[PDB]
């Protein structure tokens, strides 16, 4: 078994952590336990602090916008913590953070070619330093900065099969035009193809020219007066004409991936430890009647079906895109 | 001087 450690630039501080990814079960969130190793001659007249913060970034330079929480701990022991105490020695001081079950998940917005610095999004950072007191300034040389993450995984029990149907009645047409669609399942993994089963029965006197199917991502940012952004991730267009007084039925397959959407600004990707390549953002699982906390971006996916009648008929099929639990 | 590199270390079985 291994542990993660990071050292201070001056070589008088070290932070030990069990893991970097802390799963977010809906009932409770995995605690952030650890321990700090400090030089014997460094605490002569000082005290050692540990700070964990969660921030939402939407600015490039502080015009820059950031709003954050600071959780402050100044140093029952768990099994890992007592093992670390046994291994390191007496001069290791343990800390534990129990972050709330409701809190933004690690999501980083995709940076454009012009953006520099830290990528916009939500991230967690564990910081530990030794200072004479609070008011003393702490340089980047005398503190340890480490980045952790909060993640969720696919639910054990899949939900009901998505389905959505609609009817549009045209002006000069007595009978209406009927559309139906249905996904294969609800919970889809990353890279797994989505098979939309489109079945349209036209009884009107107007034909249908093209059928457009697209998978869209709804990044809901609650800080900007609940502004909602939707960007397509996969598009499949076919010239499937259905003549009047006739029935059509076909099955279309799509698969959202990142190799095609690199040029899109403001995409939602899973959290990054640093400048790195990460997949598309997984859907956020929310508790029943969950309050809209200000920090965080809520992402959900929906499949759209559209007929371009020679005036358009469309439906939306929500689904869930998450990683399987390991 | 910048930051250090994030490393790892062993841990006893029990």
């Amino acid at each position: 078994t291994r542990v993660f450690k990071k050292a201070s630039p001056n070589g008088k501080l070290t932070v030990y952590l069990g893991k970097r990814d802390f799963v977010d079960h809906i009932d409770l969130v995995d605690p952030v336990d650890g321990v700090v190793l400090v030089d014997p001659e460094y605490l002569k007249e000082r005290r050692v602090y540990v700070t964990l913060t969660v921030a939402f970034r939407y600015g490039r330079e502080d015009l820059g916008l950031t709003f954050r929480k600071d959780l402050f701990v100044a140093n029952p022991l768990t099994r890992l913590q007592e093992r670390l105490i046994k291994k390191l020695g007496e001069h290791a001081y343990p800390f534990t953070f129990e972050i709330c079950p409701n809190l933004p998940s690690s999501v980083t917005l995709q940076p454009g070619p012009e953006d520099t610095g830290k990528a916009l999004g939500v991230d967690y950072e564990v910081k530990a330093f030794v200072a004479e007191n609070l008011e003393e300034k702490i340089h980047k040389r005398n503190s340890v900065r480490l980045v952790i993450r909060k993640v969720q995984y696919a639910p054990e029990r899949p939900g009901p099969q998505p389905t959505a149907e609609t009817t549009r009645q045209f002006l000069m047409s007595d009978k209406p035009l009927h559309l139906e669609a249905s996904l294969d399942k609800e919970i889809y993994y990353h890279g797994e193809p989505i098979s939309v089963n489109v079945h349209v029965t036209n009884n009107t006197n107007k034909t249908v020219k093209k059928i457009k199917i697209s998978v869209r991502q709804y990044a809901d940012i609650v800080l900007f007066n609940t502004a909602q952004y939707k960007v397509p991730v996969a598009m499949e267009e076919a010239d499937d004409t259905v003549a009047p007084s006739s029935t059509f039925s076909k099955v279309y397959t799509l698969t959202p991936f990142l190799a095609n959407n690199r040029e899109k600004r403001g995409l939602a990707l899973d959290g990054k430890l640093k400048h790195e390549d990460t997949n598309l953002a997984s859907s956020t699982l929310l508790r029943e009647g969950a309050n809209r906390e200000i920090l965080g971006i809520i992402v959900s996916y929906k499949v759209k079906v559209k007929l371009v009648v020679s005036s358009d008929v469309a439906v939306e099929l929500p689904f869930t895109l998450m990683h399987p639990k390991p | 001087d910048e930051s250090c590199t994030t490393a790892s270390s062993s841990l006893a079985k029990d």
Partner: nanobody
Amino acid sequence: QLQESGGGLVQAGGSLRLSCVVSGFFFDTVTMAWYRRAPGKHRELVASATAGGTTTYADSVKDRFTISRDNAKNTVYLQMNSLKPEDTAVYYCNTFVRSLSWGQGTQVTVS
């Protein structure tokens, strides 16, 4: 960099003087310590020495080992006296907070 010296073969009663020079780092105030690892076992702590001279030893090496620290030449010495077969291990050097890279230590084998 971090490389050690002083390893060798001794009987039960001999003495060695382990040493190492660190380059690219300065320990004018850092507390430097010597670590040992018995074969097939996890690494332990053996001795320590702050810049002020306050030195602490592990209980199994008390009254025998003595850690010297040459700040001017940037070197830490461990001197071992009255060895026993239990002291067979490979010895490393590092900071007290285990901040530097570990490197490859020197081997001590006692008959």
